[PDB]
Amino acid sequence: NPEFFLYDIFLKFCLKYIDGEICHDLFLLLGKYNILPYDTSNDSIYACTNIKHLDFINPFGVAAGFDKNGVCIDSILKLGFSFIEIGTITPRGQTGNAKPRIFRDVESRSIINSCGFNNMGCDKVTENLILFRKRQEEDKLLSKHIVGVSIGKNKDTVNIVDDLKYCINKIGRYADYIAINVEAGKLKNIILSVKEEIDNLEKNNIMNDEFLWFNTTKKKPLVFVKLAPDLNQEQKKEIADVLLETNIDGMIISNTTTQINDIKSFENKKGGVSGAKLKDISTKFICEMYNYTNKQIPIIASGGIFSGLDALEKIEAGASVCQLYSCLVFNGMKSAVQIKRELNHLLYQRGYYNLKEAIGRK
Ligand SMILES: Cc1cc2nc3c(=O)[nH]c(=O)nc-3n(C[C@H](O)[C@H](O)[C@H](O)COP(=O)(O)O)c2cc1C
Ligand SMILES: Cc1cc(Nc2ccc(C(F)(F)F)nc2)n2nc(C(C)(F)F)nc2n1
Ligand SMILES: CCCCCCCCCCCC[N+](C)(C)[O-]
Ligand SMILES: O=C(O)c1cc(=O)[nH]c(=O)[nH]1
């Protein structure tokens, strides 16, 4: 506790006085040099979950955009998370938009950003992930922890499909899953090309899987797609059908929104909003896609999750796992420890045997 306590005092201080992205990069640096706290607790066997044959030791991970370049994977995971989604990465490095490009509102526990997909590029991030996988072989606390890779297109790309293909051929061997972050017909083409290129990694290697997939599952990465919440009902239906036709392994609901306008400090700011003001929107979106897909597509929840209650709402709506981002900014390093306990107590109060029982109850 005192390690978490001292750090969360420092974090509250940083939140008040210091620029967001500067703060973010400082703590990533602290994590890189391994002086952040550990959650070495055993996670409840009743809160374990899965997406098909991908097994999560607990239902909480860190969303994409937090550690874009995979420089801090060990330390973030050891805060008590079961998985992390690095990226979004692009084939070539991008600077992103002009700074400052991230702003926080403590009162509403919300964030707005216009980063513009800044990242070191696929080559550098692949090497970062490779080094992590090597460390993981030797680190007890990283056993069975999952790393997904969010992939996207370069800002001025000629061909989206071959941007994703480039990334998959580079980093796919080291990923437990791939998250696509980008029209229904166009999406179908993207999804199938990704599945095909992952299937080709298996073909063009002479090694058995144990020595081919240098990841956690020792199997080929699953394919998820992340959806933005700013769509009409027809677009959601169209997308839903595509996700069924393509037999995609899961869907991440959701990314940031642009339809929040009741935050004063953000009134003259451009970008996508996350945090508490996104919670209700993203939850409704989960129910909708859970319906439109007839519950055949596992869901990864993202948007305004801060508490065990928030989490159980996402789950009862249809989600199998939850991702945090804003929670770590406002609640600090105790976030995983705190929210895991709250969910466990709640699952008991509501009289659930395990977490899997609660999925899609409402
Ligand atoms: C600064 C910032 C950068 C982000 N970068 C990415 C990204 O690169 N790829 C992605 O899929 N989502 C990105 N996101 C969206 C988050 O992954 C997440 O979906 C969103 O913040 C909602 O979660 P939350 O309400 O818990 O913060 C980013 C969000 C923020 C605030
Ligand atoms: C205090 C603080 C800490 C922090 N980042 C942070 C919080 C917790 C952790 C850790 F728990 F993983 F250590 N790491 C980084 N961020 N990130 C942003 C933003 C919105 F600009 F991205 N603002 C932040 N403010
Ligand atoms: C305001 C500064 C806060 C100081 C926090 C105290 C430092 C504890 C960090 C030790 C982390 C150790 N370990 C072994 C988990 O890495
Ligand atoms: O890098 C960004 O600007 C970004 C990407 C993304 O997927 N979502 C978001 O809110 N910002």
Cα of 31 from ligand 3 centre, angstroms: 10
Residue indicated by tokens 């069924």: 244
Q: After which residues is the chain broken (C to N over 2.5 A)?
A: 182
Pocket-testing residue among 274, 282, 299, 323, ligand 1, by greatest number of atoms within 8 A of Cβ: 274
Task: Look at residue 356 and give its three-state secondary structure.
Answer: helix
The Cα–Cα gap between 155 and 59 comes to 33
Torsion over CA of 1, 302, 314 and 287, rounded to 10 degrees?
180
- The verdict on the CB of residue 324 being under 6 Å from ligand 1 is yes
Q: Count Cβ neighbours within 10 Å for each residue of 24-40 and write b for 16 or more, e otherwise.
A: beebbebbeeeebbebe
CA distance 179 to 321: 14
Read off the DSSP letter of residue 114.
-
DSSP at 94: B
Q: Among candidates 16, 163, 32, which has minimal Cα distance to 92?
A: 163
State which ligand 4 atom lies nearest to the alpha carbon of 115: 3
For residue 274, give the ligand 1 atom closest to its CA: 25
- Phi/psi at 210 (nearest 5 deg)? -55, -30
Pairwise CA distance, residues 52 & 130, whole Å: 25
Number of domains in the chain: 1
Q: Beta 146-151 vs 177-180: how paired, if at all?
A: parallel
* Residues in contact with 158: Cβ distance below 8 Å, sequence separation at least 6, in sequence order: none
| Alpha carbons 175 and 150: distance in angstroms, whole number | 10
Cis peptide, bond prior to residue 95, ω within 30 of zero:
no
SS3 277: helix
Residues 176, 203 contacting (CB under 8 angstroms) = no
**Contact predicate 64/86, CB 8 Å:** yes
Beta strands in the chain, from DSSP E residues, in sequence order: 49-51, 54-56, 60-62, 83-89, 102-105, 110-113, 146-151, 177-180, 222-227, 250-253, 272-275, 299-302, 319-324
C-alpha distances in Å from residue 150, one per residue of 30, 68, 93, 256? 23, 9, 14, 15
Q: Which domain holds residue 149?
A: 1-362
- Whether residue 284 is annotated as binding a ligand: the answer is no
Instruction: Give the domain CATH number at 132.
Output: 3.20.20.70
The torsion angle over the Cα atoms of residues 335, 337, 342 and 344, rounded to 10 degrees, is 140
d(CA 58, ligand 1 centre) in Å: 21
**Residue 34 near ligand 3, beta carbon < 6 Å:** yes
101 contact partners, CB below 8 Å, separation of at least 6: 21, 113, 114, 115, 116, 271
Cα gap 183→122, rounded to integer Å: 26
Q: Which amino acid is at 108?
A: S
CA 161 centroid distance within chain: 22
Report yes or no: 176 and 77 within 8 Å, Cβ to Cβ. no
Test site for ligand 3: of 1, 5, 6, 78, most ligand atoms within 8 A of the Cβ:
6
> How far is ligand 4, taken at its centre, from the CA of residue 102, in Å?
11
CA distances to 99, 153, 197 from 292, in Å: 40, 27, 28
Contact status, residue 66 vs residue 87, Cβ threshold 8 Å = no
Ligand nearest to the CA of 94: 4
Q: With both helix axes pointing from N to C terminus, report the angle between 184-203 and 233-245 in degrees, rounded to the nearest 10.
A: 30
Longest dimension (CA), the chain: 58
Given a contact cutoff of 8 angstroms between Cβ atoms, the answer to whether 38 and 78 are in contact is: yes
Is the link from the previous residue into 254 a cis peptide, with omega within 30 of 0? yes
The ligand minimizing its distance to the Cα of 335 is 2
User: In degrees rounded to 5, what are phi and psi of residue 289?
Assistant: -70, -25
- Centre of ligand 4 to C-alpha 351, Å, is 38
Task: Please tell me if the CB atom of residue 303 comes closer than 6 angstroms to any atom of ligand 1.
Answer: yes
Bridge pairing between strands 102-105 and 83-89: unpaired
Q: Is 335 annotated as a binding residue?
A: no
C-alpha 6 – ligand 3 centre gap (Å)? 8
Q: How was this structure determined?
A: X-ray
The H-or-E segment that residue 234 falls in is helix 233-245
Distance CA 173, CA 170 (A): 8
CA of 272 to the centre of ligand 1 (A): 9
